[PDB]
Design a protein around this ligand. Sequence first.
Ligand SMILES: CN(C)/C=C/C(=O)c1ccccc1O
Length: 111
Amino acid sequence: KYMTPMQQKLNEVYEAVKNYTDKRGRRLSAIFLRLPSRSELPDYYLTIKKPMDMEKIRSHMMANKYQDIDSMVEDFVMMFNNACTYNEPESLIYKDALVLHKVLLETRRDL
Ligand SMILES: CN(C)/C=C/C(=O)c1ccccc1O
């Protein structure tokens, strides 16, 4: 089937976050795309109440479950807040979550 205009707007925001690269050309999204399975990483799933990754967000988007951009932002904020809970502020993952959140809000503003 085809994508609604809203779905196309969401996908542009999604792809912006996914494709963002720092000054060295590293994609900050890499660790956020796909969490390991609960058997692979039990301590994550036993610590974080609502596990979330970019692939889960992309599925919800393609299933036409987000009503507007603020709905999808809510799930990005969950993912990023989870990364801040699970990791330390000095860590690379924690820092990248903050950059990508900024990229997300700046993309929403541009659109
Ligand atoms: C790789 N370990 C240290 C942490 C992973 C995450 O914190 C994570 C990955 C994907 C989505 C959310 C996360 O908190």
